[PDB]
Write a protein that binds this ligand. Structure first.
Ligand SMILES: CCCC[C@H](NC(=O)[C@H](C)NC(=O)[C@H](CCC(=O)O)NC(=O)[C@H](Cc1ccccc1)NC[C@H](CC(C)C)NC(=O)[C@@H](NC(=O)[C@@H](N)CCCNC(N)=[NH2+])C(C)C)C(N)=O
Lengths: 99, 99
């Protein structure tokens, strides 16, 4: 599919057994999902954005489906205001920018 | 061109006749450039991302070239960690996401 940028490029994702809406963010290196009770071990890390840093839990090898496309990778979980899909998973679904 | 996402989608821009490197960010509503002298009138506003809110200068109807493509629109100037090109100008150059 092709997604224009008139509006925020929101897509449905599946993670942790839950469907959610998330933002395809080419300016995000990583994937950050709003606070959810993901099972298993994780690692404390900090990530930064326009107005500073926030604390997140880093989970490896997390299965996620993005707009119907299967992926698996590192997912960060924490108090983000928007669920964000970053390059680490956008590359796995073959997404490009085109102009 | 078509741009993959294994690395950050960094491009050269020209603003106020000065060359800069900036990130194409589909997760940004707006365009935010690091502090610089820029010809034109501005108004103070707040923008937010991961980490919180910051203060920026809003300039409208600014001529800006992005990877050799022309845009004329709103440019926010302030303490951003990196130069970011958002949807307001990416739509002007015909950028889409594709997968
Ligand atoms: C496991 C590795 C962790 C390492 C870690 N890495 C990072 O912190 C990296 C650089 N961060 C990033 O790449 C983060 C995303 C988080 C992430 O992927 O980790 N990217 C970002 O935050 C990039 C800008 C950026 C790029 C590069 C460097 C720094 C900043 N912007 C993405 C961001 C998404 C939005 C939905 C919150 N967009 C914005 O911030 C734009 N804001 C807007 O569009 C607002 N109008 C929307 C507001 C939403 N609501 C609200 N706030 N209440 C702004 C740029 C005009 C580190 N410590 O450096």
């Amino acid at each position: 599919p092709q997604i224009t940028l008139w509006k925020r490029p929101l897509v449905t994702i599946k993670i942790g057994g839950q469907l959610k809406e998330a933002l395809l963010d080419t300016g995000a290196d990583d994937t950050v999902i709003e606070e959810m009770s993901l099972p298993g071990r994780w690692k404390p890390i900090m990530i930064g954005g326009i107005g500073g840093f926030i604390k997140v839990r880093q989970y490896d090898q997390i299965i996620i489906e993005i707009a119907g496309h299967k992926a698996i990778g590192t997912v960060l979980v924490g108090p983000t205001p928007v669920n964000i899909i970053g390059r680490n998973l956008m590359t796995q679904i073959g997404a490009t920018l085109n102009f």
